[PDB]
């Protein structure tokens, strides 16, 4: 219900001209900090691409899609509307301050540990589905178009997710609607988190967002179209992702890794910052209905591939990152049954 300490808005620090980086934002030396990602042309519906998509989801846990049915002007309007929101004076969003029991609104940290290291970012969080959680009053207000751009952007990415779910299912040799079934059909969950990474006086000591995999089903990520910062990890190597114009990055989430009995892997990512420019990225979360007990699909279980995770609802699961904040992939790996 409350934070262990008052919230410092990272924008307030960058708007000062601090000579140093506060120790709360200095990461251990062990964890202190752009390559092309092959793109998938989506208006192609059993191609070589189906092998590539499945190859990406199994070894990397992410892929980049172009020609996906979302308007490029809508993609940019979503970014610039949110960028305008974060360019507002800090005290203009303070009334939207979020709290740890729903996290909805204007936030600057994730987790409730009092001494915990912090990330160099502010963010906004809101729900889109289910409808009893959707509330325009908990949305921003200043950019007069922002709520209409959020609603349509959310509508378009819900549609895109349903189509992506069909490719993910088929690539596992399942009925093309098996994932949509496991998530709860049409009453799935959809939320949005927009991340603001202001300039950082010593970015080689800081992280815009510490390592983690997304707890939910899949993430549709719209990274900043101008500034690099997103990094994915492949076998202890942190690789900076060069964004492709008006493409999305599709992230396998923790919930799909569990459903695929670890055939699909959830990507581990982090954000680096820099001293000279900011970043704005949009994270759309497509999640299973939160009271459905999630477990490895029975279709993928043999006696030599037994189910690797016990059942757990997404309501129970999401509290791990809500209480601890980013902890890499230790949340899902501590979920592997003994
Ligand atoms: C680092 C971004 C990952 C997850 C975003 C998290 C928030 O920002 C608050 C809630 C959300 C997780 C949830 O769906 O419970
Ligand atoms: O800033 C980015 O490009 C990625 C944001 C991110 O990692 C997330 O919140 O899912
Ligand atoms: Fe993320």
Curated annotation (Swiss-Prot):
Its cofactor is L-ascorbate; Fe(2+). It catalyses: jasmonate + 2-oxoglutarate + O2 = (1R,2R)-12-hydroxyjasmonate + succinate + CO2. GO terms for biological process: cellular response to toxic substance; defense response; negative regulation of defense response to insect; regulation of defense response to fungus; regulation of jasmonic acid mediated signaling pathway. Induction: Induced by salt stress. Induced by phenanthrene. Down-regulated by UV-B. Induced by wounding. Induced by the infection with the fungal pathogen Botrytis cinerea. Induced by methyl jasmonate (MeJA). Induced by infestation with the caterpillar Mamestra brassicae. Keywords: Dioxygenase, Iron, Jasmonic acid signaling pathway, Metal-binding, Oxidoreductase, Plant defense. This is Jasmonate-induced oxygenase 2. Disruption phenotype: Constitutive activation of stress-induced jasmonate-dependent responses and increased antifungal resistance to Botrytis cinerea. The quadruple mutant jox1, jox2, jox3 and jox4 exhibit reduced root and shoot growth, delayed flowering, reduced seed production, constitutively elevated jasmonate and jasmonoyl-L-isoleucine levels, and enhanced resistance to the necrotrophic fungal pathogen Botrytis cinerea and the herbivorous caterpillar Mamestra brassicae. No visible phenotype under normal growth conditions, but mutant seedlings have increased tolerance to the cytotoxic compound phenanthrene. It comes from Arabidopsis thaliana (Mouse-ear cress). Changing residue 125 to Y: Increases enzymatic activity 1.2-fold. GO terms for molecular function: dioxygenase activity; iron ion binding; jasmonic acid hydrolase.
């Amino acid at each position: 219900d409350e934070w262990p300490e008052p919230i410092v808005r990272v924008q307030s620090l960058a708007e000062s001209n601090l000579s140093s980086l506060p120790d709360r934002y200095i990461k251990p030396a062990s964890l202190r900090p752009a390559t092309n990602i092959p793109i998938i042309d989506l208006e192609g519906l059993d191609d070589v691409i189906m092998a590539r998509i499945s190859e990406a989801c199994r070894g990397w846990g992410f892929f980049q899609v172009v020609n996906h049915g979302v308007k490029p002007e809508l993609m940019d309007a979503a970014r610039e509307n949110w960028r305008e929101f974060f360019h507002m004076p800090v005290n203009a969003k303070e009334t939207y301050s979020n709290s740890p029991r729903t996290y909805e609104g204007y936030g600057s940290r994730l987790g409730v540990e009092k001494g915990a290291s912090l990330d160099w970012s502010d963010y906004y969080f809101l729900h889109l589905l289910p409808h009893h959680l959707k509330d325009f009053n908990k949305w921003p207000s200043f950019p007069p178009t922002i709520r209409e751009v959020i609603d349509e952007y959310g509508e378009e990415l819900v549609k895109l997710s349903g189509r992506i779910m069909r490719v993910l299912s088929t690539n596992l040799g399942l009925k093309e609607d098996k994932f949509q079934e496991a998530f709860g059909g049409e009453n799935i969950g959809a939320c949005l988190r927009v991340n603001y990474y202001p300039k950082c006086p010593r970015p080689e000591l800081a992280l815009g967002l510490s390592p983690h995999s997304d707890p939910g089903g899949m993430t549709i990520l719209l990274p900043d179209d101008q500034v690099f910062g997103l990094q994915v990890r492949k076998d202890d190597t942190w690789i900076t992702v060069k964004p492709h114009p008006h493409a999305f990055i599709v992230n396998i989430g923790d919930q799909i890794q569990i459903l695929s009995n670890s055939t699909y892997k959830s990507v581990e990512h982090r954000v680096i910052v820099n001293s000279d420019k900011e970043r704005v990225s949009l994270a759309f979360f497509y999640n299973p209905k939160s009271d459905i007990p999630i477990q490895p699909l029975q279709e993928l279980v043999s006696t030599h591939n037994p189910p690797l995770y016990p059942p757990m609802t997404f309501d129970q699961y999401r509290l791990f990152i809500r209480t601890q904040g980013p902890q890499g992939k230790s949340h899902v790996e501590s979920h592997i049954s003994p």
